[PDB]
Design a protein around this ligand. Structure first.
Ligand SMILES: [Mg+2]
Length: 275
């Protein structure tokens, strides 16, 4: 699904989203800029921690500055964290079963959902004494893949960090609003939390099933898993953590390789089937 949360203070944000220990099992952080806005600022590909931090403060790479220093602290809201988590079985098959094209599938699902989120981008602009929200359609995002849950179990996820900035008629303005009122961006993202989650969730299922794997619905809002995967056995030196995960995986008796060959055969079976 997709969880929502205030982005973590511009101060510690950088190291929080990027220190190697959040993506050790994955190998790389697979981090990247996203959004029409990032493109407008010439931000593409790998993410510079310093530029990212600055972005959270309101300092953009083109000179624009939305920071608000007040008595020693910046009062510009850093932004938001939209976290897309893959289902347990997928996380396991990806980082314990070594099937990396599932990481790609996930990445493809996040890109897809995030593009929909972007259509909600907007800002408050008052004209004629009447203020109203105006769709803006551009965001500046930095995505980071992590592989570990809060309780140290495998969890492939992407923290889609949305900077609190958007361009309007050439001016960089804030998504947040210093005044309660006519529904803004993040309120609209909440009203649609299940839907964005369903978008991601359903896009992943298409990719995943394309690779040959099977899926079965196990809960509300199309929540699904891959049949047969020991999801139950999975509810700080990452090297040790991996060691344990791999061990508890063996204790289940599950045959990873056999599971994948089955997915390969099923896949080929479908491509070579006109009747
Ligand atoms: Mg994380």
């Amino acid at each position: 699904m997709m969880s929502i949360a205030q982005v973590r203070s511009a101060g510690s944000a950088g190291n929080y989203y990027t220190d190697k220990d959040n993506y050790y099992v994955l190998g790389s952080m697979g981090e990247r800029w996203a959004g029409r806005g990032a493109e407008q600022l010439g931000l593409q590909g790998s993410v510079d921690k310093d530029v990212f931090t600055r972005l959270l403060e309101g300092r953009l790479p083109d000179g624009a500055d939305l920071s608000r220093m007040q008595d020693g602290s910046n009062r510009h809201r850093p932004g938001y964290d939209l976290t897309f988590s893959a289902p347990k079985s997928v996380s396991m098959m990806a980082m314990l079963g070594g099937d990396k094209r599932l990481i790609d599938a996930h990445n493809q699902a996040v890109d897809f959902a995030v593009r929909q989120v972007e259509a909600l981008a907007s800002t408050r602009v008052m004209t004629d004494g009447q203020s109203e929200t105006v769709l803006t359609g551009n965001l500046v995002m930095a995505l980071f893949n992590h592989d570990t849950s809060r309780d140290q179990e495998p969890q492939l996820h992407t923290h889609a960090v949305v900077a609190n900035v958007t361009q309007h008629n050439g001016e960089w303005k804030t998504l947040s609003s210093d005044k309660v009122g006519k529904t803004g961006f993040i309120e609209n993202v909440y009203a649609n939390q299940i839907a964005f989650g369903r978008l991601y969730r359903e896009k992943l299922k298409e990719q995943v099933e394309a690779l040959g794997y099977e899926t079965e619905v196990v809960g509300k809002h199309g929540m699904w898993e891959m049949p047969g995967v020991p999801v139950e056995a999975f509810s700080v030196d990452p090297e040790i953590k991996m060691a344990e995960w791999m061990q508890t995986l063996k204790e289940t008796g599950f045959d990873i390789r056999a599971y994948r060959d089955a997915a390969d055969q099923r896949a080929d079976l479908r491509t070579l089937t006109p009747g």
